[PDB]
From a paper:
Here, we report a general and rapid method for discovering α-helically constrained (Helicon) polypeptides that cooperatively induce the interaction between two target proteins without relying on previously known binders or an intrinsic affinity between the proteins. We show that Helicons are capable of binding every major class of E3 ubiquitin ligases, which are of great biological and therapeutic interest but remain largely intractable to targeting by small molecules. In addition to possessing increased stability and membrane permeability, Helicons are capable of binding large, flat protein surfaces that are inaccessible to targeting by small molecules, and Helicons have been developed to target a range of PPI targets in cells and in vivo. Characterizing Helicon-E3 co-structures and mechanisms of action, we identified new binding sites for α-helices on the E3 surfaces, as well as potential probes of the disease-linked E3, WWP123,24, highlighting the generality of our approach against this therapeutically important target class.
We screened MDM2-based focused libraries against β-catenin, a key component of the canonical Wnt signaling pathway that is often dysregulated in cancer. This screen identified hits belonging to multiple clusters, including C91-C93, that bound β-catenin only in the presence of MDM2. First, we used a direct FP assay of ternary complex formation to show that H329 and H330 from C91, H332 and H333 from C92, H334 from C93, and an N-terminally truncated version of H329 (H331) could all promote a cooperative interaction between MDM2 and the Armadillo domain of β-catenin with EC50 values ranging from 10 to 100 nM. Notably, none of the Helicons that we tested could promote ternary complex formation between β-catenin and MDM4, which shares ~55% sequence identity with MDM2 in the p53-binding domain used in these studies, demonstrating the ability of these trimerizer Helicons to bind with selectivity against a related family member. Finally, we performed x-ray crystallography to characterize the MDM2-β-catenin complexes induced by trimerizers H329 and H330 from C91 and H332 and H333 from C92. Of note, the structures of MDM2-H332-β-catenin and MDM2-H333-β-catenin were solved in different space groups and with distinct crystal packings, but resolved a similar MDM2-β-catenin interaction, excluding potential artifacts arising from crystallography. Gratifyingly, all four structures confirmed Helicon-mediated ternary complex formation, with the Helicons bridging the p53-binding site of MDM2 and the C-terminal ICAT-binding site of β-catenin. The Helicons from the two clusters engage different subsites and residues on the surface of the proteins, revealing distinct structural solutions to cooperative ternary complex formation.
Numbering used by the authors:
A (entry chain A): 149 to 552, 560 to 665
B (entry chain B): 26 to 110
C (entry chain C): 8 to 20
Amino acid sequence: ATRAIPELTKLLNDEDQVVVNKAAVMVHQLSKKEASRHAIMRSPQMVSAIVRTMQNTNDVETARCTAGTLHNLSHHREGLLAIFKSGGIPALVKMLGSPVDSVLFYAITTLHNLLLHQEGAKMAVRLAGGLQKMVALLNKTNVKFLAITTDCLQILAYGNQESKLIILASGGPQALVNIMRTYTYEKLLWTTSRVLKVLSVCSSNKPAIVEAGGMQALGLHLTDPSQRLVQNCLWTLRNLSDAATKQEGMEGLLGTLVQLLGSDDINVVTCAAGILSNLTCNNYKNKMMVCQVGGIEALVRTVLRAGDREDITEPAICALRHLTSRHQEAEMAQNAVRLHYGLPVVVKLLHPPSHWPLIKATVGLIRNLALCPANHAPLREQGAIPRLVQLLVRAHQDTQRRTSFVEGVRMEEIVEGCTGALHILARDVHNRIVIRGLNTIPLFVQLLYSPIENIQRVAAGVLCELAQDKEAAEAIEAEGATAPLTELLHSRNEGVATYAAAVLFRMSED
Amino acid sequence: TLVRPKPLLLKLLKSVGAQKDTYTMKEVLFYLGQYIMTKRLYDEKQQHIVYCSNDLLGDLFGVPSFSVKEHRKIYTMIYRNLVVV
Amino acid sequence: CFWAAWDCLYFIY
Ligand SMILES: *CC(=O)Nc1ccc(NC(=O)C*)cc1
């Protein structure tokens, strides 16, 4: 039955703001039953007055009864469209500003149901004042309320970079961090982390979250039991560690990712070595802390038990390259790879079926592993020289197709790294016999014409490391090198004015 | 990189006039090149050979005559009369 | 030629 709604309609529009309180006191009361609830939904003339009384009242019981009535309609289906076709969205979001707790649990919920169980609201809320009021109400002392508020931010900023930017200018990241750093409720932390991820992929919010302190705070909950929260934190940092190279506080964060390398979840390790691969590219003391928590043994073990899976070995080799290059703990990090039996596997990654982007990082790890002379012999025993030459051969016999990426490797980089690694390996005299015996000298001379200033740095450098033995010296002075090196002594970088002259010093002298 | 040489080598650096007791490899390769050039140990005909038959270098190194650019040997001949720090 | 020698000597350190 209807037959009572126009009777209930005009009384709310009474200009006496006292009878309205005595009118809506029973509408919220009459909306509790499923029976009389259907009567209010079927009448847009009735709902069009509850909306007005909400955005136009000075009383408290009226706002609680009005917005409380709209919550009782959100559970039912055709009670949402009436709220949406009566223009309720701009009014509900308004009540996200009037300070009162009793209306917010009724307003932020009625909006939450509208964001999911009815289309269009995800666009109307963005237009009509939403993300402003939602982010502004993140400082409430309640926790369950924030579980609904933060979840509405995930629905609106989802794949919509307009909304993603909107939350940014409101001081969004700085406020979302203080929620993970403080509260302990799993459902809120799972949602807040679920929001920070769809804020990380946009390269505008990426430094802002780091700047506030997102990394150091997200690592606190890496030990929490719920894996639905754990991998979301790791997924965030993986996308969010690109711009976190220049700040401290990660002391415990590095003493936790290492233990995750010994985890039975393959997707966790992949999202753990990729973090250390990025958090060790430029920082000095970061590499110290990794070495100081046993980072080598736990990381070397990962490449062993991960197999030809390049997706795990690619960040792991880069991480070892960083810890072994240019810092105080270099002599040890180049040594702990040998003591923990990591040398043989690294040479195996050179051979197929390893793709090129991994090989590019491995041939660059060899030049760091060969700095400590205690690794010259084991590399020769594992067949490093005959393999590095093989990759060097094809890399030149592929970029020589000038007569004419996608894989991700500029083929001039493999030549830049292989001839750079051999320059370090050519220090042990036994390597200088193998490199000479493989018939490689007449190849470095052709590389000496490369217009790359990094090819000439190592090509005219590895020949300098071969110039000691006269058995190779006067052999080089025959197959070219006499004329092309003559005017390498005026190139700009002082790394090529030398070297290229260091070769000429021993050849055609006496 | 800092190294503290053994006193049987310090006499060479103290001869040109060394003051410190520890040096960088830049300074050791500097004070040593000053001695060969002061005491005249190169062969001025073709100058990439250094002679040290009955000299301090002939006692420190062990070879009566070494070339200038044999590198690793010179790098290691120095690397026995020092204790790295 | 000796002065231009020991400089390239201490270049690979
Ligand atoms: C680095 C280098 O070897 N420079 C060099 C050495 C010798 C000459 N030799 C003469 O001048 C006789 C030129 C450059």
